[PDB]
């Protein structure tokens with residue numbers, strides 16, 4: 001099998017620092033006291049460099065052979081806008097990129113921009129900008145001339161996978177569709193990305209290429225909320241239309257942003273599953289004061305069929321933050337292998353569709369395992385009542401507004 | 413502020429402890445003798461009731477002293493005849509103490525060391541992997557990385573970084589390999605390869621700019637109440653001291669248990685240069701043999717150190733007045749003394765303690781009278797130490813190697 005790494009939502013806090021005053025440990029705790037801070041971080045803080053470095057060091061010495069890596073964005077930390085700048089955002093993105101380039105000098109890496117990869121956060125523009133030009137220079141070792149051009153202009157690109165003939169990564173800037181982005185309200189095709197996408201998929205079809213879609217913010221519905229698409233409904237519907245029509249060219253979709261481990265199955269209006277969608281959890285464990293849960297840090301690995309790119313498996317690795325802070329050593333370890341964990345043959349839309357049918361059933365243990373993995377095993381005492389469970393299952397299976405409304409109507 | 417860490421040792425839980433009319437049934441550890449005057453927190457002829465250990469940890473938890481870590485130097489099973497214990501029962505007691513600690517202090521890194529009772533039969537700790545070594549590796553996994561786990565499983569020792577104190581590394585030796593009653597290690601130059609490993613570890617700490625705390629159960633040096641009786645066999649004491657003297661600029665503290673007493677030692681080179689300070693902490697158990705006239709009150713202690721630096725600033729000894737707690741049926745864990753305050757020294761550096769023990773040596777020194785009262789953790793203010801006793805004490809405090817100690821006894825007995 002071939003395989004590739006997926007990391008996302010690094011969220012470096014350069015001010016991380018263990019000290020007596022726990023309000024003064026990380027700017028990302030937002031002046032609040034870190035709750036239980038260690039060298040690898042705190043649930044109220046974004047990532048210390050030690051955390052991110054231990055993640056990449058684990059990948060490097062994992063004994064796992066991978067031919068590329070996808071990196072779906074969000075490197076700067078959660079601090080107030082006035083505490084950041086264009087210069088500081090570029091500095092953080094540069095530090096992450098150089099960390100990866102130094103540690104992995106021969107691995108092609110496919111980054112996507114996240115909503116924090118810009119100053120001010122979430123305001124990613126539909127024309128060229130300092131941040132887009134900067135990341136185009138930063139990621140030149142991995143991208144051709146045409147990808148550099150589109151990235152500099154709109155924050156998105158496509159690129160052939162050098163080590164995998166017949167595979168192409170499409171890296172979308174889905175922050176253009178993200179609710180908080182006040183730069184793109186009421187535009188029908190912000191930065192022409194839709195027209196660009198269709199052109200690119202059309203060319204991949206005729207060059208007999210397979211396509212992996214990557215982006216930061218995903219399609220579909222936020223699984224913990226009611227009727228809340230991750231991106232604006234209008235853009236979600238239009239993107240999903242493109243994905244459904246090209247579902248035989250697209251062999252996988254990969255997203256981050258939610259900081260959780262979620263599955264989705266893109267389906268038609270009739271219940272034919274068409275593509276498999278994978279939302280990866282964050283390296284940062286950060287949470288607000290009120291939130292009951294957060295994720296353990298996570299990195300993950302995908303296995304696919306050589307020269308074919310059908311997804312065969314996924315391996316989710318994680319770091320137990322409380323224990324790593326307890327002993328002062330990062331024990332990055334196997335959380336689960338998807339096929340083994342859910343007893344499915346592979347990751348094809350059909351296998352996952354049948355597995356989520358099992359999820360639906362009453363007191364499904366499959367769904368309990370899934371819910372425990374949603375938080376990257378942060379808390380097995382976490383529970384999901386039947387309202388919670390309906391919201392989750394309906395978001396997993398129904399990506400478009402009408403399938404989703406029908407699911408909630410029939411099952412809430 | 414300053415950094416602080418706790419030291420507990422020799423818990424010696426007796427799970428049979430039990431107030432009943434027949435005082436030969438109060439505790440297996442009295443070995444059928446009549447408990448003297450048993451109360452809820454123990455008896456001088458018994459090992460620790462679980463109520464006593466839990467009161468010690470409860471006091472630590474609710475003391476209002478912050479601490480970034482704890483060291484725990486061994487001996488959890490009680491003193492009962494070998495045929496009354498087993499490997500399974502030893503593991504069961506060790507597990508209970510570990511879980512008690514993890515339950516009350518879930519985010520406190522603890523650094524355990526094995527004691528000579530932490531094995532069945534007692535004292536027979538082996539030089540290869542074993543049921544108990546594996547089990548405690550399992551048990552202590554939350555606090556220890558992969559390399560520590562590997563050495564612990566094989567020989568019962570490890571080193572480990574202090575998560576909360578970067579630049580600090582705990583070395584937990586298994587000195588029971590050197591302990592006279594250990595029949596598994598006779599005529600062995602480096603049992604379980606611990607010396608070789610220790611030297612390697614210290615060399616690594618040198619080049620990684622780490623300071624080191626040595627912890628173990630059985631101490632180096634000479635038993636302060638006897639003549640010419642090293643706590644571990646002479647051959648091993650000399651070898652270990654040679655290592656400690658050579659690395660005494662890297663080692664910022666040594667901490668031991670086993671003697672159930674409050675004792676100081678100053679490791680010195682052959683010319684009296686005080687090199688490195690040694691703290692033997694008294695036990696939680698108050699157990700004593702029938703003929704034995706004195707024993708210790710239960711004790712636990714706290715060390716203060718310079719942050720990012722690990723020079724030792726002070727030590728606070730806390731104790732339980734056993735008779736008082738048993739009289740009312742409620743404990744009152746309380747300050748026995750602060751070392752700088754008790755002895756008017758500036759800190760815990762070798763030079764400061766060296767000067768202090770020079771004062772000890774003077775005739776009718778009040779400093780040494782206070783020290784000898786604290787030796788039993790204040791168990792008897794009428795316990796006295798004649799001039800022979802004093803010479804044994806002072807010479808054991810200052811002279812850890814046989815040559816030094818012989819020289820001291822010659823000049824002063």
Ligand SMILES: *[C@@H]1O[C@H](CO)[C@@H](O[C@@H]2O[C@H](CO)[C@@H](O[C@@H]3O[C@H](CO)[C@@H](O)[C@H](O)[C@@H]3O)[C@H](O)[C@H]2NC(C)=O)[C@H](O)[C@H]1NC(C)=O
Nearest residue numbers: 709731732733734735736737739748785789790791792793
């Ligand atoms: C720990 O608590 C015990 C019990 O409270 C303390 O022992 C008690 O100490 C008092 C004061 O010395 C003793 O009373 C005195 O006895 C003599 C005659 O023996 C008498 O002349 C005095 O007027 C006074 O009554 C008392 O007997 C003794 N109790 C027991 C059970 O031994 C002990 O001092 C405490 N330890 C520390 C370090 O404070």
Ligand SMILES: *[C@@H]1O[C@H](CO)[C@@H](O[C@@H]2O[C@H](CO)[C@@H](O)[C@H](O)[C@H]2NC(C)=O)[C@H](O)[C@H]1NC(C)=O
Nearest residue numbers: 320321322323326377378380514515518519554
């Ligand atoms: C991550 O590590 C922590 C600490 O080592 C684990 O916390 C323990 O969890 C169990 C219940 O799940 C309790 O019985 C223990 O008392 C907890 N703490 C300690 C100090 O023992 C936690 O289980 C680990 N996470 C996972 C997914 O295994």
Ligand SMILES: *[C@@H]1O[C@H](CO)[C@@H](O[C@@H]2O[C@H](CO)[C@@H](O)[C@H](O)[C@H]2NC(C)=O)[C@H](O)[C@H]1NC(C)=O
Nearest residue numbers: 426427428461462463507508509510511512515
């Ligand atoms: C450790 O052992 C103690 C003492 O045996 C436990 O507390 C006792 O639990 C037993 C259950 O067998 C009860 O019969 C006793 O009444 C309890 N109290 C006393 C004072 O004996 C304690 O629960 C154990 N702890 C762990 C973590 O296993």
Ligand SMILES: *[C@@H]1O[C@H](CO)[C@@H](O[C@@H]2O[C@H](CO)[C@@H](O)[C@H](O)[C@H]2NC(C)=O)[C@H](O)[C@H]1NC(C)=O
Nearest residue numbers: 331332333334550553554555556557558559561
């Ligand atoms: C590092 O993490 C792994 C995974 O949690 C630990 O290995 C497991 O340890 C548990 C607890 O003893 C066992 O139940 C599992 O069977 C182990 N699995 C494997 C594959 O070994 C490992 O011990 C941890 N290392 C340290 C030093 O804490």
Ligand SMILES: *[C@@H]1O[C@H](CO[C@@H]2O[C@@H](C)[C@@H](O)[C@@H](O)[C@@H]2O)[C@@H](O)[C@H](O)[C@H]1NC(C)=O
Nearest residue numbers: 195198199200201202203204205206207208
């Ligand atoms: C879809 O693509 C067709 C083929 O495009 C040409 O050939 C492929 C192999 C690529 O090299 C591509 O870049 C070339 O331009 C076009 O003939 C057709 O016009 C396209 N259709 C649309 C609607 O864009």
Ligand SMILES: *[C@@H]1O[C@H](CO[C@@H]2O[C@@H](C)[C@@H](O)[C@@H](O)[C@@H]2O)[C@@H](O)[C@H](O)[C@H]1NC(C)=O
Nearest residue numbers: 608611612613614615616617618619620621
């Ligand atoms: C003493 O240590 C020196 C330092 O190098 C170490 O190398 C590896 C093994 C790690 O432990 C690393 O942390 C250290 O920097 C060695 O170069 C030297 O050979 C060692 N000498 C002896 C005699 O052991």
Ligand SMILES: *[C@@H]1O[C@H](CO)[C@@H](O)[C@H](O)[C@H]1NC(C)=O
Nearest residue numbers: 021022023030031032033034
């Ligand atoms: C943080 O906790 C400390 C507890 O010592 C308290 O003094 C301080 O006021 C707290 N600050 C905030 C912002 O909660």
Ligand SMILES: *[C@@H]1O[C@H](CO)[C@@H](O)[C@H](O)[C@H]1NC(C)=O
Nearest residue numbers: 014049094095096098099102
């Ligand atoms: C990135 O920042 C970290 C944290 O300040 C620093 O340790 C590291 O050297 C930096 N790396 C690069 C390549 O700038």
Ligand SMILES: *[C@@H]1O[C@H](CO)[C@@H](O)[C@H](O)[C@H]1NC(C)=O
Nearest residue numbers: 433434435436444445446447
């Ligand atoms: C213990 O004391 C009881 C009651 O005074 C006495 O009958 C018994 O002989 C004593 N047993 C031993 C072993 O000393």
Ligand SMILES: O=P(O)(S)OC[C@H]1OC[C@H](O)[C@@H]1O
Nearest residue numbers: 009074078115116257258259
């Ligand atoms: O990192 P962000 O893009 S601000 O937000 C994405 C995730 O982290 C915080 C939010 O609650 C959401 O779960």
Ligand SMILES: [Zn+2]
Nearest residue numbers: 009011074257
């Ligand atoms: Zn994020």
Ligand SMILES: [Zn+2]
Nearest residue numbers: 074114115257
């Ligand atoms: Zn985001």
Ligand SMILES: [Zn+2]
Nearest residue numbers: 422487670695
């Ligand atoms: Zn003991």
Ligand SMILES: [Zn+2]
Nearest residue numbers: 487527528670
């Ligand atoms: Zn002992």
